[PDB]
Swiss-Prot record, chains A, B:
Methionine sulfoxide modified-residue sites: 32, 58
Membrane-spanning residues: none
Outcome, altering residue 121 to P: In AMYLD3; uncertain significance
Portion of the full sequence shown: 79 to 265 of 267
Name by which UniProt lists this protein: Apolipoprotein A-I
Species of origin: Homo sapiens
Cellular component annotations (GO), alphabetically ordered: blood microparticle; chylomicron; collagen-containing extracellular matrix; cytoplasmic vesicle; cytosol; early endosome; endocytic vesicle; endocytic vesicle lumen
Region annotated 10 X approximate tandem repeats, chain positions: 1-187
Amino acid sequence: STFSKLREQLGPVTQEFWDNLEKETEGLRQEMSKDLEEVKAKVQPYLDDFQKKWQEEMELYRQKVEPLRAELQEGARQKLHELQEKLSPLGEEMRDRARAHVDALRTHLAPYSDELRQRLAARLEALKENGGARLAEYHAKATEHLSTLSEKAKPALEDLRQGLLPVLESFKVSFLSALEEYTKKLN
Amino acid sequence: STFSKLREQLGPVTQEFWDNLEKETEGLRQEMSKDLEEVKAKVQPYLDDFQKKWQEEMELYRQKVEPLRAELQEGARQKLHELQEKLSPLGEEMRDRARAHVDALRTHLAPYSDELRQRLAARLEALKENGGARLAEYHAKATEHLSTLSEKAKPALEDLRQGLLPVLESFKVSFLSALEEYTKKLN
Ligand SMILES: CCCCCCCC/C=C\CCCCCCCC(=O)OC[C@H](COP(=O)(O)OC[C@H](N)C(=O)O)OC(=O)CCCCCCC/C=C\CCCCCCCC
Ligand SMILES: CCCCCCCC/C=C\CCCCCCCC(=O)OC[C@H](COP(=O)(O)OC[C@H](N)C(=O)O)OC(=O)CCCCCCC/C=C\CCCCCCCC
Ligand SMILES: CCCCCCCC/C=C\CCCCCCCC(=O)OC[C@H](COP(=O)(O)OCC[N+](C)(C)C)OC(=O)CC
Ligand SMILES: CCCCCCCC/C=C\CCCCCCCC(=O)OC[C@H](COP(=O)(O)OCC[N+](C)(C)C)OC(=O)CC
Ligand SMILES: CCCCCCCC/C=C\CCCCCCCC(=O)OC[C@H](COP(=O)(O)OCC[N+](C)(C)C)OC(=O)CC
Ligand SMILES: CCCCCCCC/C=C\CCCCCCCC(=O)OC[C@H](COP(=O)(O)OCC[N+](C)(C)C)OC(=O)CC
Ligand SMILES: CCCCCCCC/C=C\CCCCCCCC(=O)OC[C@H](COP(=O)(O)OCC[N+](C)(C)C)OC(=O)CC
Ligand SMILES: CCCCCCCC/C=C\CCCCCCCC(=O)OC[C@H](COP(=O)(O)OCC[N+](C)(C)C)OC(=O)CC
Ligand SMILES: CCCCCCCC/C=C\CCCCCCCC(=O)OC[C@H](COP(=O)(O)OCC[N+](C)(C)C)OC(=O)CC
Ligand SMILES: CCCCCCCC/C=C\CCCCCCCC(=O)OC[C@H](COP(=O)(O)OCC[N+](C)(C)C)OC(=O)CC
Ligand SMILES: CCCCCCCC/C=C\CCCCCCCC(=O)OC[C@H](COP(=O)(O)OCC[N+](C)(C)C)OC(=O)CC
Ligand SMILES: CCCCCCCC/C=C\CCCCCCCC(=O)OC[C@H](COP(=O)(O)OCC[N+](C)(C)C)OC(=O)CC
Ligand SMILES: CCCCCCCC/C=C\CCCCCCCC(=O)OC[C@H](COP(=O)(O)OCC[N+](C)(C)C)OC(=O)CC
Ligand SMILES: CCCCCCCC/C=C\CCCCCCCC(=O)OC[C@H](COP(=O)(O)OCC[N+](C)(C)C)OC(=O)CC
Ligand SMILES: CCCCCCCC/C=C\CCCCCCCC(=O)OC[C@H](COP(=O)(O)OCC[N+](C)(C)C)OC(=O)CC
């Protein structure tokens, strides 16, 4: 705690020194910023005037392109309205024919699909009956060759625990005194 | 280990029974699948025939409108050129005016970018001459603080280590000794 008290004492001394030193440079820097600020406002009017001139030219062009925009808009509009009228009848026709085809397709496969799913249903059911027999037998044997393990694993773990306790207990006691023996040095 | 051996002993026995049983079901499932697939091969043709019908229809329809779109596209190809010719002239008019604007814009900043460099250097030179003297004091006083920083840092650590080793070395002994005992029981 010696260094802590000394460091806090030496600091304030140079603290004021560096403060005044930085303050001096700060003051000088402000002068530089002040002159620079003035220059910024000096060229401002010149940049403003030039900008106004630019705007005038751009607005003039906006007015010139206004009528042309309307004309080109009409020319483009007149193109689609002519084409759409010649493409609609063809599309309208084929759409109905396609739609009707899908419906007929579904109706055609309906009876075929119905019989297939019906025949397969019985097939799967017959197979299930046989499988269930063998399945049941396997289930009963599965549990028989399962419970036997844990039944002898649990008691063995308890016995093991009882044999480690004595050694651990004595070790814990030494750990306590050892731990606190370190705290004294740290603190 | 005997517990797990008992599990492995009757393992393959049960597996062999179930595996052979499942193999028997395989042949049954195979026969069922073959008899099902045989019928599915009859349903397919009826779908293909229907699909192939509409396919040819669409093929002919598509061919019918083939040159029809060409007539429309041809007009679009020409109308395209028309709109371009009526818009280009105006763009060119402003294009020349744009380049003329750049000429003035460049010459308007050219001299400033030079004087800006002059003022910048003058400011830096003056600042350097001023701060150059304080930079030395900043370092001089900083080093003095550094000496009072890393002085009693190392010596204190050496003393701390000496008052720990004789206690830690003895702790490892008890730890390692107990380890061997636990291993014996666990193994
Ligand atoms: C250089 C880069 C540009 C400037 C960066 C710093 C800008 C200012 C900000 C912090 C400065 C450092 C501040 C360090 C802690 C200072 C703590 C202190 O002394 O407080 C008392 C006074 C006043 O402080 P405040 O201005 O914070 O006012 C506090 C008051 N309660 C309120 O908020 O109303 O102090 C003062 O008036 C002047 C103190 C001068 C200390 C020495 C001077 C400290 C100034 C700069 C260096 C600080 C670190 C020095 C060591 C490392 C570098 C060598
Ligand atoms: C049970 C399912 C989950 C655990 C599965 C563990 C599978 C084995 C994995 C590691 C054990 C071996 C770990 C390495 C042991 C040291 C190496 C050894 O001696 O291997 C002996 C032989 C031959 O070699 P490996 O099989 O080990 O393979 C090559 C070997 N590792 C090498 O280095 O080349 O393999 C064997 O004897 C089989 C040993 C295991 C028998 C089954 C051991 C099974 C586990 C426990 C049984 C004993 C305890 C029973 C009571 C408690 C039950 C929870
Ligand atoms: C580089 C290796 C250094 C090894 C030694 C330790 C570091 C020494 C270096 C600098 C030390 C600076 C002082 C550190 C604390 C010294 C003891 C001390 O003052 O205790 C007391 C100090 C009181 O601080 P405050 O007056 O701000 O109180 C704030 C409110 N609470 C927190 C007190 C409730 O505690 C602190 O300042 C920390 C919050
Ligand atoms: C020059 C070498 C020796 C060290 C010199 C000082 C180095 C810088 C010290 C601290 C960093 C901040 C410096 C600038 C602010 C100083 C004042 C300050 O608020 O410090 C931070 C704090 C202030 O505590 P106060 O109770 O005064 O509250 C002030 C208002 N605020 C900050 C709470 C909003 O105190 C500390 O954090 C402990 C150090
Ligand atoms: C060639 C590279 C360098 C180019 C430098 C160009 C010139 C730069 C000079 C100054 C920077 C711009 C200054 C004008 C915008 C300031 C924006 C800003 O954040 O103001 C922040 C703050 C605003 O303060 P107030 O809202 O109270 O009113 C303005 C300041 N006065 C008039 C009250 C003092 O400033 C101050 O308080 C005083 C410093
Ligand atoms: C590396 C450079 C990056 C920046 C490039 C573009 C620099 C600016 C472009 C050209 C420089 C000259 C610009 C001239 C017009 C400036 C317009 C401007 O900002 O007014 C800024 C400000 C605007 O408010 P006023 O109070 O003026 O008027 C009312 C508000 N309205 C209507 C103007 C939105 O007015 C001032 O601050 C007074 C000086
Ligand atoms: C790959 C695309 C190539 C396109 C090239 C440029 C094509 C230019 C064609 C048209 C330009 C846009 C015209 C937008 C208005 C169309 C108005 C119109 O269609 O009147 C004809 C009819 C009814 O139109 P309405 O005015 O009653 O309703 C739509 C328009 N309003 C009302 C919302 C403004 O609609 C049709 O016959 C289309 C099924
Ligand atoms: C070998 C390939 C196996 C994978 C592809 C199988 C393709 C279809 C052929 C055979 C599969 C088995 C068909 C027979 C058993 C069907 C079992 C089943 O869950 O029926 C499910 C369901 C049963 O009928 P519903 O849910 O309609 O009930 C009656 C109607 N209401 C009361 C619900 C309104 O029918 C369907 O969901 C049709 C999809
Ligand atoms: C390699 C030979 C051993 C193979 C064992 C695995 C294969 C077993 C063969 C067929 C059956 C597999 C599915 C059933 C396995 C479990 C059978 C059994 O009764 O376990 C025992 C028990 C059964 O419980 P429940 O079926 O009455 O259900 C109760 C509610 N919860 C838990 C289902 C939400 O469950 C447990 O004790 C917890 C694990
Ligand atoms: C390598 C270990 C593999 C462990 C799983 C395969 C071997 C064990 C399988 C089956 C064991 C069958 C014989 C079990 C004899 C001991 C039975 C026993 O003590 O039950 C003890 C206890 C009984 O609890 P409850 O009957 O009130 O059931 C409550 C609902 N739950 C928790 C069962 C979902 O349940 C447990 O302690 C474990 C959750
Ligand atoms: C690697 C060099 C040798 C390190 C040997 C370490 C021997 C002890 C092992 C772990 C403890 C490390 C403590 C590190 C911080 C020491 C200073 C410290 O924080 O004291 C205090 C710290 C926390 O516990 P405290 O009791 O102080 O605070 C909470 C309880 N009360 C106070 C609210 C009632 O103590 C520890 O965290 C454990 C000692
Ligand atoms: C939007 C769906 C309309 C459905 C009803 C109409 C279906 C028939 C209409 C078009 C089908 C494709 C016709 C293909 C033969 C005519 C192609 C043709 O125009 O050659 C004339 C001309 C040039 O054809 P190119 O083959 O040289 O194309 C340019 C080169 N690259 C890009 C092909 C490498 O066409 C054009 O310049 C573009 C309009
Ligand atoms: C309202 C009408 C405008 C909107 C609807 C347009 C419908 C037609 C759309 C695309 C196809 C027709 C595009 C316009 C007619 C093009 C006629 C033509 O020159 O074919 C051939 C032409 C060959 O082009 P090159 O690759 O040899 O390059 C020539 C030089 N430049 C242009 C690259 C500088 O193809 C093209 O230039 C690509 C467009
Ligand atoms: C509301 C308005 C909506 C849009 C309306 C658009 C109306 C016009 C339609 C499409 C716009 C693009 C038309 C492009 C036609 C291109 C015709 C063409 O290049 O012939 C070829 C001719 C020479 O091509 P070169 O490759 O030798 O030179 C130009 C390209 N390089 C060389 C500079 C890379 O083109 C020129 O000489 C241009 C100076
Ligand atoms: C944050 C404001 C308060 C603190 C301001 C501290 C200003 C710098 C401190 C002292 C002025 C610079 C002294 C440079 C020589 C002493 C060592 C040193 O500083 O190394 C840091 C730095 C570079 O030093 P050198 O380029 O000499 O490199 C090492 C020497 N050899 C290998 C190049 C031969 O210093 C500077 O860049 C000068 C600004």
